[PDB]
Design a protein around this nucleic acid. Sequence first.
DNA 1: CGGGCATGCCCG
DNA 2: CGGGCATGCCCG
DNA 3: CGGGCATGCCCG
DNA 4: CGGGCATGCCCG
Lengths: 195, 198, 198, 198
Amino acid sequence: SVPSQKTYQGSYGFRLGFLHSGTAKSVTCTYSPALNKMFCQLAKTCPVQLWVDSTPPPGTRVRAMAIYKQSQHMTEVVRRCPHHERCSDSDGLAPPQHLIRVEGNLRVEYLDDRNTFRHSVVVPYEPPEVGSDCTTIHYNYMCNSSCMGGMNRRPILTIITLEDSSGNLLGRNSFEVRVCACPGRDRRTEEENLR
Amino acid sequence: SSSVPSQKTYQGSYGFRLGFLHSGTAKSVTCTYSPALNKMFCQLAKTCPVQLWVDSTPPPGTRVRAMAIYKQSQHMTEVVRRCPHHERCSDSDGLAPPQHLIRVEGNLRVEYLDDRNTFRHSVVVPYEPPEVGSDCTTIHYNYMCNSSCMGGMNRRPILTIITLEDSSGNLLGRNSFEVRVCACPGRDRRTEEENLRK
Amino acid sequence: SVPSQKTYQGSYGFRLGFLHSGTAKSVTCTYSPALNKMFCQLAKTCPVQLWVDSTPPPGTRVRAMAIYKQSQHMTEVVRRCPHHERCSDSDGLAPPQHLIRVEGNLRVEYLDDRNTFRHSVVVPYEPPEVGSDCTTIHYNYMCNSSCMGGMNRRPILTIITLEDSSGNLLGRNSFEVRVCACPGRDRRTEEENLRKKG
Amino acid sequence: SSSVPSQKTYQGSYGFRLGFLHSGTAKSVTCTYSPALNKMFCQLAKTCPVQLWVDSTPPPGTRVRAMAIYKQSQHMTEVVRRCPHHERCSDSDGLAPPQHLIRVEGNLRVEYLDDRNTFRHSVVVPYEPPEVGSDCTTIHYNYMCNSSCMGGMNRRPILTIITLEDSSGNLLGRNSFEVRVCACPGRDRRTEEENLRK
DNA sequence: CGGGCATGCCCG
DNA sequence: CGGGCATGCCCG
DNA sequence: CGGGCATGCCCG
DNA sequence: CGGGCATGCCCG
Ligand SMILES: [Zn+2]
Ligand SMILES: [Zn+2]
Ligand SMILES: [Zn+2]
Ligand SMILES: [Zn+2]
């Protein structure tokens, strides 16, 4: 199977936002709007903002899941490589096999889907803090796109889904990710190549 | 890695809550509480008064335990302990094991627990009701490393969890607060308060 | 942990020889006499000649084992990285964790030493072909020097020993190995680096 | 307390002296030397190249030793060692004792000593003559605590004493220089040199 | 690396 | 924060 | 192959 | 970080 990637802003006008951090060679996380693509370093903080037109109900949850972008790879589960799965860099909460973690949220929940075997990470939705217009989740990606026996230089998309407390769809957005050593260098390269 | 202690306020059947003095924000005040942040700022080894306020009186045998945990969910499963330097300074008061971060001062009935399963440290004293003409019981805590101590807290923020417990360790009430141990509590309190809006 | 790497011709005058090869950028296997170092691609045939002054007894065996060259890594067992171990690329005889295999020899034995945990591969010694001067063994190396989780960019030596049928040592020689994508380029580079010493 | 090695610079009969790299004062330069102060400023664990210059070649078996002492008369008898945090960090190069402040890198012949009488730490290497095309021999030192380290140097300045010694440890030559290990060597050298002037 | 600050001390 | 500095380090 | 790039990572 | 290079892989 393949999880849906279709954008769905939904009744709450769900949108993503990203920080605008530029293309210095080793910027930790930066986002290319031309490419709708986050470029980020392994294990570093990757902020993703949730913007809504109105507040979803209490019990609302926010899930992230990686899939391969290329059609020929889409049915293959995205996992960490054999090396990084064994590095023992757990924060005590995340399963060692999961590519995507959330940092700074003790209510984080990881799922290994019993039917599709896909990995995902979910947290409760919380409204923006006073004086803030969005809710920010800190994600970490735990292998480079280049990892042999893992993503193996294949691009991924992250799919962010807003769900009710039972798992019903409320909203969906997505972005491509490249996890790399020098996000600024690589962003500039793919955009210049775009031009 | 260690399972994570709850930090949720639980007044329980004795209406248990905390109180803190009003000490101001002079640059190097020894201890000061920020109601806005629910955060104590204090100097290493200096007296940190924490008031226990109840509605009904807990039965004799009730104990009051304090434990530190890392605030950041990503360090929360790691035991909070003193740094290698201060563990070796010989500044024990006669009862506190040297690796323990939190001490209680002035109480001969104090006990220190190095837990067998979780390895977490805690310090416990019998609950005593307030003096006649007092509305609360005050415990004097000390924190024996700076938040900045390398190889200890290592600039990571902590929470202190205060639990009311029965003589067997069962939960009766709980409250918590963040703590920064630092050189200039008044200065840092002001900085962090200013950060709320910046 | 570390087996001796000390060159020992022993009573049979045991030496290693190596085929002439170029430094064509991606030549499959090339030996640098200057460096005493083989440069080869992953899973490619690597010829190693065995030379003796006198014939060892029947039942003699030829063993090959990799160790890290650098002294701070010497006690760590050289093995294949987690990815390559799991690639199901075995020849049918080599256990998948073994770095060094022998090609074209059904009398090969692979040993995972129960005491030292080191891997080695052994074949019976067969004297040179009638007329010929040496015996050639074909080795393969199943990870790049670069493999993360495996050699991780650290230089190794291959130690070749002649042993009697009970495992008593008769002779010993060695050579450095880099397993890499472009053995010709890299031999060229390392030889250029040499000349700049100084 | 420990008796105090001489720091008195003298070239002796082989004309022994040190050269430093004049790397300027960029804020975070890894290592830099002030001639006006005779003082090296360097970051923790970074390469500190020290050149050995001689007018004539010393004999086979000549060695070169480095040792730190406190510069301040009131602290001179105290052994200089790493702080408890850094001693316990996972930063070994597989050779240096974890308590030793000064290491040499890039040399398997390095030897570390705790003095039988003074318990003072030193690091020693064989003297090698300059490489072809060079007029000096360069040693790469590393300093493994900051001058500021609590429980270690604790903001007290040190000298490093470099001695040229015969194979028996008799002194052939000596040169000393002040060291500050710090996060911003260029900043702090520029500051200290500013502070010379009226 | 290093601007801008975090965070120690008062013979800092 | 009382003013002034010594002195470490995140993240671009 | 030889030329050149993708992409991790060390130096200051 | 920016400069450079290690080191896999691809292109024509
Ligand atoms: Zn990986
Ligand atoms: Zn401490
Ligand atoms: Zn491999
Ligand atoms: Zn130190």
